[PDB]
Design a protein around this ligand. Sequence first.
Ligand SMILES: CCCCCCCCCCCCCCCCCC(=O)O[C@@H](COC(=O)CCCCCCCCCCCCCCC)COP(=O)(O)OCC[N+](C)(C)C
Ligand SMILES: CCCCCCCCCCCCCCCCCCCC(=O)O[C@H](COC(=O)CCCCCCCCCCCCCC)COP(=O)(O)OCCN
Lengths: 152, 546, 144, 443, 108
Amino acid sequence: SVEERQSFHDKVNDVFKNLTGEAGKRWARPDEPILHTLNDEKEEPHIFFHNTNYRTSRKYINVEKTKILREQALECVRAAGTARYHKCTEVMKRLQAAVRVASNVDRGPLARKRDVGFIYHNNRLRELQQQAAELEIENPFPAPAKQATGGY
Amino acid sequence: MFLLSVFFPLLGGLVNTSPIARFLGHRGSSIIAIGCMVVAFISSVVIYYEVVFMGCAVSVDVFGTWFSVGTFHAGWTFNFDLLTANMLFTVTGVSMAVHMYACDYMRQDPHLNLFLGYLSYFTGFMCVLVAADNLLVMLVGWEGIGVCSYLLIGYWSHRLSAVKSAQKAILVNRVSDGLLMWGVLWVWYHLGSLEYDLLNVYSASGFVGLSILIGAMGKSAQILFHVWLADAMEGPTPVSALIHAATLVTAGVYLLVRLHIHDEMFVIIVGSLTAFMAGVFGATQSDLKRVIAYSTCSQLGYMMVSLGLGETGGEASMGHLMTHASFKAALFLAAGMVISGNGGNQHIARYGGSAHSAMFTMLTLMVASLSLIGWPELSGFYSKETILNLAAICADPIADVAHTLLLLTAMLTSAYTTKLFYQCFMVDFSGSSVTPVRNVLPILAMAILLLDIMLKVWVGTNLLSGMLFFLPWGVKTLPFGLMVAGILTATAAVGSERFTLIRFCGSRWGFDQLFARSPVNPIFDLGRITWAIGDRGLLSVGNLRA
Amino acid sequence: YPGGSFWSEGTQTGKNGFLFGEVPINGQPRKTLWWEPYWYAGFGGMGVGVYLIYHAKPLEALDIKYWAAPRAAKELETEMRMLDKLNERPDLKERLVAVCKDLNMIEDEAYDLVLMRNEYKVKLGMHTGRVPEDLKAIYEELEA
Amino acid sequence: MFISVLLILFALCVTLIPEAHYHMVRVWSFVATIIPMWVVTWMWWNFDASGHGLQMLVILGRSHLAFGIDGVALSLMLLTTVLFPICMMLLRTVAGFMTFILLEVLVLSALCVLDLLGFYILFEASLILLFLLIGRAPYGSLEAAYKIVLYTMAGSLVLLPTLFMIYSECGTTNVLYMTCAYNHQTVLGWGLLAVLAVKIPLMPVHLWLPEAHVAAPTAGSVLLAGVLLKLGGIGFLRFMLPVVPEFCVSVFPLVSTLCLVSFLFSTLSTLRQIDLKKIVAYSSIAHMSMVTLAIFSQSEFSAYSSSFLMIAHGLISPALFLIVGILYDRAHTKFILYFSGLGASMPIGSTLFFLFTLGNLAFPLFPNFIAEVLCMVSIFAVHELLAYVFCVCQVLGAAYGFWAFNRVVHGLPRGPADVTRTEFHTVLPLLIGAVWLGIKPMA
Amino acid sequence: EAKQFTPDGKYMPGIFSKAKPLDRSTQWVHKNPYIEAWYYRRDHFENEFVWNYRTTIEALWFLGGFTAAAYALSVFAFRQADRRSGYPKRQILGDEPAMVLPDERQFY
Ligand SMILES: CCCCCCCCCCCCCCCCCC(=O)O[C@@H](COC(=O)CCCCCCCCCCCCCCC)COP(=O)(O)OCC[N+](C)(C)C
Ligand SMILES: CCCCCCCCCCCCCCCCCCCC(=O)O[C@H](COC(=O)CCCCCCCCCCCCCC)COP(=O)(O)OCCN
């Protein structure tokens, strides 16, 4: 109801008014988001700015994860030499998965979903091959690949 | 020693173009340039022996991170592996002799130290190109050699045709640079990194190999992009030697060999068509430098087909690049000496005899010409025969036509190279200027490249030399017969009466004339429409008279 | 060559042109233009200030990527062994793939779901019930 | 705030200096723009990059006019405070000093305002100053001044009722509460598109720029190209994208086709230009079209790449205007047919012209290269063809750039002598900024 | 052979002097009348616009034609991006009520 929404707004305003934090902690780098059942979180501005700060933190952390994994994968591949085809597939897979998470989470309203492994493409090729088998016509598409890159 | 192969020619260019050179003059700047190339060549020799023979690659973080926004991460990092060591040895060794030649060839130029600094910058950006471990530092090298090629082609700026040749090289390469940039975007988007060691592609989205192939066709001057290469003869002879041997034209082939993400049908068709086209183009030219330019285009076609054949074909492609640089630079330096001995004339109808040149210039032209035509047990014999035999056993039916085109091209090459020797020395004299050059510096510059030609026979480029791909004696010894056929035809000096074919080929199939009006004049006219009819017309809002 | 050799003296003394078109008057030192002290003070104090911003600010204060680099490393440490255990447990993997199907993800995106346990949508969806209740349990036995 | 009042009051004291003390007038007006550069550098020192998005806030009660700093505003403010003393070195009268001082106050306060009505009040209070600057009596053009003022007024008058519509809808024009309320986004989105598509030159409302940016003096051209176009971009990034995002998604095909046709048609027009200043003036439209499409992609790190392209353009194109201004000041023409062989007669000026030509064409070791790569990463992530259109048309930019350079720099040597110390030091901060931001921009 | 500086600096204007002083306008170009006329005409080329046959035809096929091509390409790219992101059909301007703005709390 309107009364319950109003009392919740008053509680949120009181909490964010009397808020403090010290000892090496930055406010606007919060540890946890504020969990809510609100229709349109922008109904409560303090919760919206808090979760905005948390989401900014997560995007930058995922970028950093991608860089650490890329350094590790470079070390593996350069040490392995010509044996890199069977030695460093797993670390390449983990780097590609981290890049996928760094791009596809909180992506914006317009960008398409990024597949670093050609994994959506080969999954679609599998499903289209299966559909063309039941359709009992020739497949106009390529057959799906087992792996497309050095990772996936 | 590893960073001395890349930094130090750039340092020589920085010294010879800055106001430090105001205190050295021509005499001091020549010393600075030659020493700054000798040090880089010594460093590249050490790198070559460590990486090629003992197999220990070296990765250097040079200047930290360049730029890193989101997951797009470009770093100032080098990696010195087998291909990089091969390219560095080739580039620095050719550029040292070209610097030693240019310090005497351009002696009477008024701005000599500026020319030497431009040569050093061009060499250094080539070293940056091949030493890079990711795509963006490679693009630094790509556009750096493009800019230095513009500065060196249009060096004699008071001549309008030289200025227009430099602008043409920039624009033709800018089309392929755009396609290469879009391909880099595809590669990074669907693999997640820019470093070469993390770019292992089994099955990609087609636009990747096509757009990277177009970007390589621009720099390596393949079909429908070769038009800038012939006009780049407006620059001085050291510029042409360094463009056609070690820098610029070998960069696209290096990029395709490094990445190995092409689709072989396009690569084989483009390479074989380029080889046949440049073979028939060079057979019908009379400008001494234009024949050598078209032979460069033809050999780049051979290397393109080879890297289409496979991984072994990619190794053979790199091997032919490495052996081609030495005798091509030697051919250009000998041609420059012949031109200077004949009063600046470049037409082969006004040569003849053995008075306008030194004994060493004639020996250099003879030995480099014999390596180019695949004379047995010289340097080009091993690499060219390897590519030809690999093309004779490919299981792709497309490679059947490509092999025939390559054999016809081999006969044409032995025709026009023998014609270049025959017109220059064997016929009676038909010039009027005899001023033969016998200075120490250009003779030593030629002797170094002949030593590298001997070195390629004695020590191979890779392990393919001596491997036997099992072919019958008829298939194996046919290119020798095609070489002999070219030699016999060119020394007989015979011609045909089909003058319309002669003038269709000699005018180089009309590519420049057709390009002068199929994109160029329409671009000008569409600009007229967008300005006059749009900005001044349809969108213009007038005044209210009162 | 002058003197008959490459190794002789040079042949030019004096000004080789005039820098900025400035010619010395009566041998006097060049008079300082009106803007020069203020230009050098202003732009030099901007350049030194930009240098000190890049080289003397605390790293977390200079760029947020230095705040997140140590926090990504520990999360990656506790995620690499989760991914190691997932490669050894087929029952946990098939339960993760079931949760991936519920979240409109494909089977190859199983590694992605482990790597996004701290995301805003996953925490809020565990709170709201859009996320399946089993995913928290799978995270619990993959961390254990 | 107290500092800003002190800086304004120190700047306004130029009028009270008696005109017979020429040296004092020059030194005072130059120092009055040097000081805000130091203050904005200090603001960059004070900024916490791991803290909140909005820092150093101040709000002046119930008068609107609320202020705050984010990254885009801070980079643009640093660029403006660099550009204004160079403008001070190119003027000779107290009227010019006072017009540029008032313009600096208005630009600096507009770049960091957080109120839409405050943005409206602060920005187009510069209209009459631009009219007097462009239509100056002996050497300006009144037609150009009328065009720029009337186009800007038309766009602002479209915005003003929609501004007041959201103000009556929610109760405030503060952007922090406008972004959290429910508003009719189509109407306000059309008003904001109307202002910012005139400020950024987007076709068809772009015809004021070729007249105004050429008829202006060299200082006016430096200001108009390097600063005032970017107020449309910061308008997009600060006000329109946060407050009307549903509109910003729904208008994307229209904004996309406007950006594509602006890029292509303005590049095609630049090739037929015969005036050097008109050549430099057209090239800015294509760069701003790439900026606008990168802002509207909203895809990877779109605010970052688009702000970086705004900074790279704001460094490179004022230097080209400075070189054209030197040629015009000491040869009295801007016509290409009167210039040839400038390499032999101005070697330093031609070297600077070549370096800034390469920078304008987004070659590496210049900040435009990094900028265009990241902008095309942001564009590519929506669709590959929208990136391909900009990629394949790179020959068209290089054609006009190298054709203009080759026509004026090579050939028979005719034209003025090389640059003075003052002209070299007008150019020099832009070159140092370009070398830094193109080699090691970040740490 | 003018003298615009004293031996200790001190610029002199030479207002009443016979010798011509070197100054800012020393290298101003001598104007060619036909070049000035051509640049004036190109500066005022909007007076030469006329709705004849060629103007109308080229303004239709190139200006309107490429504008329509770019609008079609933009809509194509928008729809393909929404399909490759797991979205339904989305509401552009004049497209009936539909989905705009995906929710971050939702898995697509
Ligand atoms: C939208 C982000 C802003 C980026 C805009 C592009 C800037 C252009 C140049 C790129 C330089 C990158 C600098 C990175 C480190 C500097 C500090 C920093 O972190 O940047 C600041 C802002 O950076 C700046 O202001 C950079 C100034 C660049 C302007 C340079 C041009 C002016 C110089 C002209 C030439 C002077 C030469 C004088 C010498 C003679 C904040 O940005 P973010 O890290 O994104 O903010 C974090 C977000 N949050 C708080 C929510 C967590
Ligand atoms: C108009 C165009 C002109 C073109 C010019 C040539 C083409 C240039 C193309 C690339 C330009 C890149 C220049 C980068 C400048 C410095 C960037 C790094 C700044 C910095 O603090 O880094 C440290 C500086 O180290 C060092 O710098 C090394 C320490 C000193 C020892 C060597 C001294 C240099 C000798 C160079 C000779 C001449 C070479 C000419 C290029 C290295 O450490 P890091 O923080 O990155 O840590 C990682 C590894 N430790």
